[PDB]
Ligand binder design. Sequence first.
Ligand SMILES: Cn1cc(Nc2nccc(N3C[C@H]4CC[C@@H](C3)N4C(=O)[C@@H]3CC3(F)F)n2)cn1
Length: 274
Amino acid sequence: PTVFHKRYLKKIRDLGEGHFGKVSLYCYEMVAVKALKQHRSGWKQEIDILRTLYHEHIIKYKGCCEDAGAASLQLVMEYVPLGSLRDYLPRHSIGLAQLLLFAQQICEGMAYLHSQHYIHRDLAARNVLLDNDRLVKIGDFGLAKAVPEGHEYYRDGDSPVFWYAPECLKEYKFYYASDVWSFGVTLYELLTHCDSSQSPPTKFLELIGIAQGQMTVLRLTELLERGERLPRPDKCPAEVYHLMKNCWETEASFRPTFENLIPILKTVHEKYQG
Ligand SMILES: Cn1cc(Nc2nccc(N3C[C@H]4CC[C@@H](C3)N4C(=O)[C@@H]3CC3(F)F)n2)cn1
């Protein structure tokens, strides 16, 4: 609800861009401001969403301002200092216990998101932000959607297909279980420390090849239904990988909820946290 006056706004630098908008670091206190580059109508929804989302593992809304240069509003948020895990992990040697802590927190955050009856549709390492080495936050909701009252699923080249479940690439339906498939891929990223050479796009394209023209997704869909999966990350515990494969069930109903995962991650964490 707070109003930011674009007059006390000093642009420090760019923090990122993707899908619809761009995010820049601003001085006012330091804030991260997101701006919109049909897309317009969703932007009104996204903002409202973030305004009504309050959780220790979801980026904090702080207000809006007059984006004079683009017929709408900008979305002011808190500045998460250490950036996303995709940015951070490649540069910092993090232990397994810590990574599992991040994982548990992502689930806590996702569990809360779903209980608000929202799907995310873009859960990846690039969208998880590091506040400090013991705190992580979901930092973007550009694709987030409200799940229709009387349905269990919600119905683009900018889609993160390498993070998506088969029912998304195939039936174009997005279930809460779909986000869980995404979490599994996000868990994989963490365990590989977001190394570029091991990324979902890179590894999935090694399997599919690049002489597939307009059929990248169709090939992707059918290798997933042959039961093929992302490899086990080196130094990834056996049971953890099993936890990954369980999130990657072809049958979405065989997938654990984020509810179910919190208890399990909590225990696997305490284990290796010793
Ligand atoms: C590089 N860096 C970033 C920080 N911290 C920080 N504090 C708040 C938001 C934020 N975001 C950037 C990224 C990650 C989530 C979303 C917001 N981002 C996007 O790129 C969205 C797609 C889009 F541009 F709209 N990043 C520090 N260094």
